[PDB]
Design a protein around this ligand. Structure first.
Ligand SMILES: *[C@@H]1O[C@H](CO)[C@@H](O)[C@H](O)[C@H]1NC(C)=O
Ligand SMILES: *[C@@H]1O[C@H](CO)[C@@H](O)[C@H](O)[C@H]1NC(C)=O
Ligand SMILES: *[C@@H]1O[C@H](CO)[C@@H](O)[C@H](O)[C@H]1NC(C)=O
Ligand SMILES: *[C@@H]1O[C@H](CO)[C@@H](O)[C@H](O)[C@H]1NC(C)=O
Ligand SMILES: *[C@@H]1O[C@H](CO)[C@@H](O)[C@H](O)[C@H]1NC(C)=O
Ligand SMILES: *[C@@H]1O[C@H](CO)[C@@H](O)[C@H](O)[C@H]1NC(C)=O
Ligand SMILES: *[C@@H]1O[C@H](CO)[C@@H](O)[C@H](O)[C@H]1NC(C)=O
Ligand SMILES: *[C@@H]1O[C@H](CO)[C@@H](O)[C@H](O)[C@H]1NC(C)=O
Lengths: 55, 239, 29, 248
């Protein structure tokens, strides 16, 4: 399941660059760094929330 | 081939002005009347090198100094270029970089506490090293911190080696060295250095101390064939 | 000790090794 | 340079006038480590290395000994025993572009932390999952780097900062890098306490009629004491006499 979570956070930041919202992507980038070193899955919810604010 | 160095390879040991005075100093100098190799190849550097050359067409342009042959000194046209780098050069013509028979050129190359010191003299000539006396002055001092054990000359030249000998250097009124005594050359020179004069008055002078030297080394221990039981002390099961 | 005429006469010198036997070092004892 | 591929400039054989940077007032951060920032000018080093890179404002805090984070660990690592001065400044009006400046990159996905002063410039795809990538990006396979989309309208933590860490090499060596030791003025015909390039003492300095050789800096008497000095800036020779004394 963890592999899919990381993939989703990644696809989200990729889209945020495409949409012209580099700041939002940078925020998500930080979620990736932290996620990859922790068991805290709420970082996915944050990546998704940030995308919703942008879209 | 070899030549007679006569009284050459003397340089101003420091940057101190002295006049009308005889100063005794110990430094790395070419010994007087020493045996200098005559090259009409990679050579040892030892404790420092005396280098000299005679020219007709300025065929010698530079030198390589280092270990696993390093720094390169090249006199290309009018501006001498010095670089210290790893090089991939039979050579012929990076923490530091600097840019500046009829003719006799003399150089002294020594490396002390990381500083590569270059002294030199130029004079016109009209066979091998001319007999006479002059002193070489410092021109370049490279703060590199590089080990030198061997060197190579890049294209006649003479190569000698410096030794920790004591010299008596005579300074004239204008601060130049006009005469020198090699204190290890002969008993008369020893007397001159002892009296700190280039002239010795009639008499008997004590100049040194003779000591018979040991030949070989004699070592004697009793007929002990066993080994001390340290294992029973340090690797014991119980203390 | 170095035994010498003044250098204004000659640079020839003689050397005296004090309190030694010559075989240890014109040789005159 | 980018932070992932940071650039190292060697500073050597020169005068390290640190006051040029320290008092410029153009830096937001001028944090030094191991040396007071106001005492740098009195030091000599074997070498100084200037490591140049770009990060975002919220990453500036990572450029320090003992720190962790995607930059401190995956792009630019400083050692716990690191000596040097770290400087940084805001470049939002220089290094940003409309639509986003994506010309500079950092690593986000890494297997392990960097060693001090390590520079990894590899473009190999990172394997995040249990399966091999075999050179192909996709599920659980990512090119380790991510561009910094610096935009002029981003919040401060997301604005670009230029950072130039200065690393000081202080080993046994001949001095190559020394601070801006400055002169005063000259005093003549008076008793003065002097220091000429390390030559020190007290006495009265007067114009001499002595001529030194071009390479000589000072002179001495028969009783190896100094009696004349060359002026380092004028190159004239002055005699040094004792400062008057006697019994009463
Ligand atoms: C140098 O040594 C050689 C012996 O190897 C000798 O024949 C030659 O005369 C010497 N030359 C000088 C200047 O001492
Ligand atoms: C000597 O060589 C250097 C290259 O290392 C070059 O830059 C310099 O101009 C040359 N000097 C002259 C006088 O041609
Ligand atoms: C020079 O050689 C000595 C051994 O003779 C060694 O201990 C020293 O580290 C070397 N220095 C350099 C700069 O290579
Ligand atoms: C010292 O230099 C002057 C020229 O300035 C010269 O006339 C004088 O003879 C020189 N003195 C000696 C001892 O060489
Ligand atoms: C103790 O045993 C080790 C392992 O064989 C050996 O290396 C060591 O020298 C022994 N100590 C002494 C005092 O013999
Ligand atoms: C001493 O040397 C001088 C030359 O400088 C000479 O004129 C004089 O006659 C010499 N005196 C003696 C006793 O030889
Ligand atoms: C020197 O040694 C020899 C023995 O080889 C001895 O006969 C002679 O008397 C000794 N001379 C002196 C001055 O000791
Ligand atoms: C020392 O610096 C001054 C400028 O302040 C200059 O005019 C003078 O010529 C310099 N000294 C020498 C020996 O060039």
């Amino acid at each position: 399941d963890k592999e899919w979570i990381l993939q989703k956070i990644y696809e989200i930041m990729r889209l945020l660059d495409e949409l012209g919202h580099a700041e939002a992507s940078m925020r998500v980038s930080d979620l990736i760094y932290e996620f990859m070193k922790k068991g805290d899955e709420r970082l996915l919810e944050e990546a998704e929330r940030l995308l919703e604010e942008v879209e | 081939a070899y030549t007679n160095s006569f009284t050459r390879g003397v340089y101003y040991p420091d940057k101190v002005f002295r006049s009308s005075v005889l100063h005794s100093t110990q430094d790395l100098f070419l010994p007087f009347f020493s045996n200098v190799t005559w090259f009409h190849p990679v050579l040892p550097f030892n404790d420092g090198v005396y280098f000299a050359s005679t020219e007709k067409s300025n065929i010698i342009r530079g030198w390589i100094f280092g270990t696993t042959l390093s720094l390169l000194i090249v006199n290309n046209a009018t501006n001498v270029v010095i670089k210290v780098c790893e090089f991939q050069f039979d050579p012929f013509l990076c923490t530091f970089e600097y840019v500046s028979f009829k003719n006799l050129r003399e150089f002294v190359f020594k490396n002390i506490d990381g500083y590569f010191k270059i002294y030199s003299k130029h004079t016109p000539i009209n066979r091998d090293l001319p007999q006479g006396f002059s002193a070489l002055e410092p021109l370049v001092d490279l703060p590199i911190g590089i080990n030198i054990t061997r060197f190579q000359t890049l294209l006649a030249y003479y190569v000698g080696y410096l030794q920790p000998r004591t010299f008596l250097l005579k300074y004239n009124e204008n601060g130049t060295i006009t005469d020198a005594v090699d204190c290890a050359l002969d008993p008369l020179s020893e007397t001159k250095c002892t009296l700190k004069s280039f002239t010795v008055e009639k008499g008997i002078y004590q100049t040194s101390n003779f000591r018979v030297q040991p030949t070989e080394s004699i070592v004697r221990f009793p007929n002990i064939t066993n080994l001390c039981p340290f294992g029973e002390v340090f690797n014991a099961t119980r203390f | 000790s170095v035994i010498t005429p003044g250098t204004n006469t000659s640079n020839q010198v003689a050397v005296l090794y004090q309190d030694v036997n010559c075989t240890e070092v014109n040789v005159f004892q | 340079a980018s932070v992932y591929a940071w650039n190292r400039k060697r500073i050597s054989n020169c005068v390290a006038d640190y006051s040029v940077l320290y008092n410029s007032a153009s830096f937001s951060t001028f944090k030094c480590y191991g040396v007071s920032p106001t005492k740098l000018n009195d030091l000599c080093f074997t070498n100084v290395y200037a490591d140049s890179f770009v990060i975002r404002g919220d990453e500036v805090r990572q450029i320090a000994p003992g720190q962790t984070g995607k930059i401190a660990d995956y792009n630019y690592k400083l050692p716990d025993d690191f000596t040097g001065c770290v400087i940084a400044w805001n470049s939002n009006n220089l290094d940003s572009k409309v639509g986003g400046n994506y010309n500079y990159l950092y690593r986000l996905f890494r297997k392990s932390n960097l060693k001090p002063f390590e520079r990894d410039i590899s473009t190999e795809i990172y394997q995040a999952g249990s399966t091999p990538c075999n050179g192909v990006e996709g599920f659980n396979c990512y090119f380790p780097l991510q561009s910094y989309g610096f935009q002029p309208t981003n919040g401060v933590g997301y604005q670009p900062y230029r950072v130039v860490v200065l690393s000081f090499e202080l080993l046994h060596a001949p001095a190559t890098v020394c601070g801006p030791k400055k002169s005063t003025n000259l005093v003549k015909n008076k008793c003065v306490n002097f220091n000429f390039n390390g030559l020190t003492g007290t006495g009265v300095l007067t114009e001499s009629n002595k001529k030194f050789l071009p390479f000589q800096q000072f002179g001495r008497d028969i009783a190896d004491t100094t009696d004349a000095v060359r002026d380092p800036q004028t190159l004239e020779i002055l005699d040094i006499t004792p400062c008057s004394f006697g019994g009463v």
